[PDB]
């Protein structure tokens, strides 16, 4: 509350460390469905169904231009990429499996870097 604060967690390396995580997600062999925005002209149903499209290149641009206020808003966009994937793709598909694999890979790196 006013003039009553928990001890200050060092957040000075968060930007660099989110960048490293994102680099590792970008270079994973199963990243290919997620590297670029879904083409809304060429994929029937995507525009109407997925209210907030997100992909790795859009996260990279937001990160590089100071559009993440803190590490949690960064995690929320990464998770959105996988939530969107699950909304649109069957579990038993190459893309559906890719999204599950990448979500796992992310959540471990997130826990190990920050928890």
Curated annotation (Swiss-Prot):
Domain of life: Eukaryota
Subcellular location: Nucleus
Tissue expr: Expressed at varying levels in several tissues, whereas a smaller transcript was expressed specifically in testis.
Domain Bromo positions: 9-113
Oligomer and partners: Component of the BRF-1 ISWI chromatin remodeling complex, at least composed of SMARCA1 and BAZ2B, which regulates the spacing of histone octamers on the DNA template to facilitate access to DNA. Within the BRF-1 ISWI chromatin remodeling complex interacts with SMARCA1; the interaction is direct. Component of the BRF-5 ISWI chromatin remodeling complex, at least composed of SMARCA5/SNF2H and BAZ2B, which regulates the spacing of histone octamers on the DNA template to facilitate access to DNA.
Function description: Regulatory subunit of the ATP-dependent BRF-1 and BRF-5 ISWI chromatin remodeling complexes, which form ordered nucleosome arrays on chromatin and facilitate access to DNA during DNA-templated processes such as DNA replication, transcription, and repair. Both complexes regulate the spacing of nucleosomes along the chromatin and have the ability to slide mononucleosomes to the center of a DNA template. The BRF-1 ISWI chromatin remodeling complex has a lower ATP hydrolysis rate than the BRF-5 ISWI chromatin remodeling complex.
Similarity comment text for this entry: Belongs to the WAL family.
Protein's name in the database: Bromodomain adjacent to zinc finger domain protein 2B
Gene: BAZ2B
Parent-record interval covered: 2054 to 2166 of 2168
């Amino acid at each position: 509350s006013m003039s009553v604060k928990k001890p200050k967690r060092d957040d000075s390396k968060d930007l660099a460390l989110c960048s490293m995580i994102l680099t590792e997600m970008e270079t994973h062999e199963d990243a290919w469905p997620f590297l670029l925005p879904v083409n809304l002209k060429l994929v029937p149903g995507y525009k109407k169904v997925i209210k907030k499209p997100m992909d790795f290149s859009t996260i990279r641009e937001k990160l590089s231009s100071g559009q993440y206020p803190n590490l949690e808003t960064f995690a929320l966009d990464v998770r959105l990429v996988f939530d969107n994937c699950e909304t649109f793709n069957e579990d038993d598909s190459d893309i559906g499996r890719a999204g599950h694999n990448m979500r796992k890979y992310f959540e471990k790196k997130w826990t190990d870097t920050f928890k």
